[PDB]
């Protein structure tokens, strides 16, 4: 029932928490290409995915979890052309067993960003 908060990932400005730990799991909010200071990170899909993955690590770590405990990820891209570049960065962050995953290209993401990744991991 605990909300996770870390300053190593952009702060939660709205009616949401970066992450929530409940019933053995950690539910992480969709992370976008924002630096810890809330500034948007410009660049192609590789550059933006990197920031999102870094924000995910930060949140997961603050929860007492980590990328190796992630069981499911939901990945939204704003363009079909970014599937390959996103997967490339995404691959650097995980090792077997890999999380279950779903990836789709949506019409648009918060603030016009290229990528948003949400996930569910195991709590300790």
UniProtKB/TrEMBL annotation:
InterPro entries on file: RidA, RutC-like_sf, YjgF/YER057c/UK114
Top-rank taxon, per record: Bacteria
Residues making up the signal peptide according to the UniProt record: none
Any one GO molecular-function label of the UniProt entry: deaminase activity
GO CC annotations, alphabetized: cytosol
Family: Belongs to the RutC family.
Name of the molecule in the record: Protein translation intiation inhibitor
């Amino acid at each position: 029932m605990e909300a996770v908060k870390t300053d190593r990932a952009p702060a939660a400005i709205g009616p949401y928490a970066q992450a929530v730990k409940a019933g053995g799991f950690v539910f992480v909010s969709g992370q976008i290409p924002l630096a810890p200071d809330g500034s948007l990170v410009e660049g192609d899909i590789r550059v933006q995915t990197e920031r999102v993955m870094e924000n995910l690590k930060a949140v997961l770590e603050a929860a007492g979890s980590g990328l190796s405990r992630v069981v499911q990820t939901t990945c939204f891209l704003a363009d079909m052309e970014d599937f390959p570049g996103f997967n490339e960065v995404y691959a650097r962050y995980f090792t077997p067993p890999y999380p279950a995953r779903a990836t789709v290209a949506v019409k648009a993401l918060p603030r016009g960003v290229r990528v948003e990744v949400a996930c569910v991991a195991l709590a300790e």
